[PDB]
Amino acid sequence: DLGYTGLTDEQAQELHSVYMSGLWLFSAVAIVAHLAVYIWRPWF
Template sequence: MSSLSDSEAKEFHSAYLTGFSGFLAIALVAHWLLYTWKPWF
């Protein structure tokens, strides 16, 4: 089990999802830009 309380775990999860969503958005934009420059299909 974790040493985090329920509220701390929810706060961490929220921050994790925010960071992951930002990373995913940047990755998708980067892949789209690369594909428009040099299509790999």
């Protein structure tokens, strides 16, 4: 479509899927650390 970066739709889809997989993994790791710290010493 716009093609400001020379990326086809399917290439963008594949890269975005990989990026969001890593994002969810990182978010889950942070959530687990947050719950562990909250149990150890809550901030609320």
